[PDB]
Amino acid sequence: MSLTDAVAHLSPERWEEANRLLVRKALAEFAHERLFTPEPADGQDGRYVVRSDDGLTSYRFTAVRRALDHWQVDAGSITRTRDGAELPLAALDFFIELRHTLGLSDEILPVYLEEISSTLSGTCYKLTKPQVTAAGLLEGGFQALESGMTEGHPCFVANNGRLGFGVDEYLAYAPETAHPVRLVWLAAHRSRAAFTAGAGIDYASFVRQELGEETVERFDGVLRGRGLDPADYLLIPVHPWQWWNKLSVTFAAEVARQNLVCLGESDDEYLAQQSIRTFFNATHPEKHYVKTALSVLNMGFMRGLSAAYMEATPAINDWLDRLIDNDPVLKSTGLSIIRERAAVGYRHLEYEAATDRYSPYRKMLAALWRESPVPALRDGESLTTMAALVHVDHEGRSVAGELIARSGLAPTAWLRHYLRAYYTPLLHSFYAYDLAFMPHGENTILVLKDGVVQRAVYKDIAEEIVVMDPDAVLPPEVRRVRAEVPEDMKLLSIFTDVFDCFFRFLAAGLATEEVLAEDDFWRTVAEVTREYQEAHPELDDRFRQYDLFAPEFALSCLNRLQLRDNRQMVDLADPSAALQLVGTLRNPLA
Template identity: 50%
Template structure:
C-alpha cells in the first residue's frame, strides 16, 4: 500500500474533514458536535498559524488520515520543563473505515507519519499528548518507541505527555524495518562511508606525523599512492601548512577497510603485537559511531549557525581532530552508546552515592562550603529523600558525603567491583538525581540541562577511550580547587587578560572515595580512579546580552555533506573573513601567549577545553576549562604550597610547544586548512594574521621582551610532537600524566607557517 502526505486543502477537504472529526470513533478528537463552520474556523486558524500545520494522508490515492504537526513551544504545551529544542508535536487521526477494517493499517499510517516527522533532520523528538483514557493510542505510541512522561491538564482532557526520540523510534520499528536490534546504522553503504572517512583521516594524520610517506602519482596531478603491506592505495589530496593533509575520502582506490589498513601497517606504525587487537577494537568502535552519526545525526551546519550551546555540542561528529581511533569507548555496549554518547543527545540523570565521610575527601575552592555546594546541586526534596534512604538503613546522614557517579559506572563497576564497600555501607546507592544532564564531547563531563546555570559535573568512567581509561584519581584531584583558585586569581589580576575577556571556568570542588581495598592493599592502578567527581563552573552565568557560547571544537566541524561550521559562521557574521579570524585570534591566541610570556603558564587549549563566546557570530572572548589536570607552570614563579604540583621541568625547546604544538599544530592548522579549502581565506593570509597577533602583543608589552625572545614563537621551525605515535605505542596509557614531557614523541621539526617571510 502506498501512503502519501500532502498539505491540507481546506476548500477541497472540508466536508470530508467534518465527517472524520465528528465520527463516533473520533471521540478523543473532541469535535463530536462541531458544525461545518466550526471545523472551518478551527482549520483556518491552523492554516494561518506559522507554528501549526495540517496535512491530508492518502492510501493508494484515497483520503485516509489527517496529520497535524506543531511546534510545542507555541502550543498549549509551552513552558513545560520537559520540552527541549528539536521537539515536534504531532496529532494523527485515521479515517473511519468504509467497510471492514484493514489489519495493520493504523500501524502503517503511524509509521508513515513518524517518518514524515523525522524527515526533517532538525527534529530530535516527536511529542504527543493523547487523552490519558485512550488506552489504544497510548499502546500504539509505546510500541513505536514513545516514553510516557506524566499526566498533564489540558483544556477538555487530562493528557499523557509522551516523547519519542529518533533513535527510540528506529529501534522500535526502524525506517528500514529492522525489528528493534538497534543496528539500523550498520549497513554496507554507511559503513563504506565510515571506512573511507577514517582511512582518509588515517592517511592524513599518519603522514602528518611522518609515519607514512605517500608518493606523488606522476600520471595524475594531485593524486598520490601509498603502499600498505601487500596493498597499494591511490587517492587525491592537498597538503597545507604544517604538513596538513586533506585526503578526499571518495577518491580512495580500492575501497578501503580501516581495520585491514591499520593491521597491514602495524609494523610501520609501531603498534606492539600484544596491543594491536585493542587498537583494532577502538577502530571498530570509531567506525560504528561514524555510521551511527551518518544514519541518525545528519544536522546541516546551516541549522547550527544560530543553534544553542548544547545543540552544537551534540551535533559534532568528528571527535578529536588528530587521533585516528578517537571514539573507542571500550566498555560501552550498544545500549550504553545510545544512552550516553554525546552525539545521541539523550538526557542523563546522574546517580548519587553516599560515601562514608571518614574515607572520603571533599576539597573546596574559595567561596565554597559543603552546604552551599550541595544546596546548589540538589533540591531540598532530593536531599531529604537521600537522607531518608540513609536513615532507613539505620545510618546517620551526617556521617556521609554525597558523590555523583555516571549511571554506567554504578551498574558496571561500583555495584560489582566495589560490592564489599556497598555491603558494609561505606558506599550507599541513593538513586538518580532530579536534573537532566547532557554528556559533553569529553563523554564523562555533564552539562546541566534542567538548570544551565549550575555546575558541570565531571565523573569517573572506567571505559577505555583514546589511550586512557577515563578515571579520576582522588589523590591527584585533591589539589584541583586550589590550583583553579590560583589560576583564576592570576588571570583576574592581569590587566591584559581582563582586556581580552579571557577567563577560566573554575573547578570549584572535588570529591574522591578511598576506603576500598585497592587504596588500602594494592599499588597505583586504574582501580584507584573509579569513585571520584568534580564540579566546574558553567559558562552560562557569565554571558552578557547578545552573547552565546560555543565549544571551540565546533570550528573544526564539517557536516555529513562536507559543509564547515566555521565557514558558515563567517558568512553569517557582519565582518569579512580576515576580520573574523583576527577577532578569534585576539580572543584565543593572544591570551595564551600572554600567559606563557608573563607567567610561564601553559594550558591544554584544544577545542573541547575552551569555550568561545560569540556575538553576531564572531568570537569575542574565550573561557578556558579543564584547569586542574592540564595546566603547567614552566618557570620559577612562586606558587602556594598546595599548587606546587603544577610546576614542571621542561627543556627550553619543549616549553614553546605549549603554543607551537597545542595551538598551531593542534588547532590552527585545521582551521586554516578549512578556510583555505572552502575558499574563504588564503592560507598565507591566515598565518600572517597569526604572526601579527603575536607581534602586536610583543609591541604592546615591551616589559616581556626577554620572555618573547626566550620562547621565540616565530622561529623558522619547531619540534614536531606527535599524538598518534603516543597512542600507537601504548593504546592503554599513552602518557604518564605526572610526567608528560618525558612521554612525548617527536618526528623532526615542522616549518613554522607563522614565521616572518624571508
C-alpha cells in the same frame, strides 16, 4: 531496548562510508607524522600512493598539500589495489596490512582494532542523524552544537573508541546521541570520602542549591531508614555506567558495609558533553557541570578520576581565577575559566594497599562540579565549543564559514577578534607566567555575539595546566603543577597544541571553503603576535629565548603516541619522556 533497533545504524552503506572517511583520515594524519611517506604515483602531479607492509597492496589517492605538512586527502579518490584488482576499503585490513609500518605490536593491535571498530560504529550512528547545516547548528544553541560535532579531536585516528560501552550503553551514554542521563547518587562515609570546597563553597548549602532541599531531605531519609546518621556521610554523583558495571561489583565491600549507600537517581536530566564523562545539566543550565569517574578507554587514556587529585583541584582553580582578575593584560581579552568549584573523592583503603599510585583502581570513584558558562551571558550572547570551528556540514560550509558570513566583517577582521580572545591569552600566560594549557577544541568555549568571538572560556584546568618553572612561587596545594620541561620543548604547548593540531585544520578548511587563503590566515597570526609583543617590551628577553618566529619547529607526533601505548599514551609523572619528535615543520610565521 530492542535487539534489532540497537544495531540498526550498522548498515552496509553506512559502514562503507564510515570506513572511507576513517581511512582518508589515517592517510592524512599518518603521512603528516611521517609514519609513511606517500610517493607520487605514476606520472600524476596530485596523485600519491601508500603501499602495505609487503608492498603488494596499494592505496592510491589524490591529495592537496598545505601548511604544516598538511594532507587534504580527497575521500572520494581512495582506491585499494592488489594483484590488479580493486579490493574494498576496510579500515581493519588497513591497520593489519600496515602493522609493522605503524607501531602496532602483536599485543596492542587487537585492542586498537576494537577502538577502530568502535569509532567506525559511532560514525555509522552519526550518519543516521538528521543532517544539520552550519546555520542549523548555531540556531540550535549550545547543546545542539556539542552533540552536533562529528569529528572529535582532529589529529587522532582512533579518537572515539569508548571501549567498555556495549551497544545499548553507547546509545544511552555517547554525547553524540544527546539522550538524557540521570545521575546515580551515593552517600559516602566520611572515614573514606572527602569534600574539597573552593573559595566560598559551603557543603550544606552547595548540595541544597544543587539538588533542592526536598531531594536532600529524602537522601538523608534513606540513610536514617538504614539506621545511619547523615552527618557521617557526603554525596558523590556517579555515572550510571560506572555504578552498574564497576562500583557495585569492585566496591561491593563498601556498599555492603554501608561505607557507600546507593541513594537514587537525580531529578535533573544531564547530557554528556564531548568528553563523555562530563555532564551538562539540561533541566537547569544555570547549575554546575558534573565531571564523573568513568573507567572506560578513550583516546589513549582511561577516564577514571583520581580521588587523590580532587583534594588539590578547587584550590588550583581558585588561584587561576584570582590570577586572571589581578592581571589587566588578560582582563583585556575577556578570558575567564569555568572554575572546578568543588570535588569529592573516595579513598579505597584496601585497593590503595593493593596498588601503586598510578593505578586505575584508585581513579574509580571521584567527581567534581564545574561552573556553568551560561548565567555569565549578557544579552545577545551565545555559546559554542570551539571544536565547532573545524566542523564542516554536509554542504562544505564550516561553522567558522557561517560565522564569518553572519558577522559581515572581512575574514581577517573576524579572525583578529577570535585570536584576540583565544590565542593572545595563551601567549601572555606562557611568556609572562610560564603557564601552559591543553587548549584544544574540547577544552575551549567561545562566547558569540552578532557572529563575532567576544571572549574565550577555558576548562579542564587542574588536571591539565603546567607551570614550567620549578622555582616559581605559589600557594601550597598549587605547587603540584610545576614541572621541569626541556627548554626546546617548552614552546610545544603553542606549537603543537595550537598550531599543529588546531590552526593547521582551521586555516586549511577556510582555504578550501574559499573564505580566507592560508597566507592571509598566518599573516594575521603573526600580526596579533607582534601586536602583543611590541605592547610588552619588558619581556623581550624571553621573546628571543622562545622565538615563535623560528623558521622550523619540532614535529611532535600524536598518533605515534597512541600506537605505542593506547592505555596510557604518556606517563603522568614524566609527560615529556613519551613524546615522539620526528623531524621539523616549516613554521608558517617565517
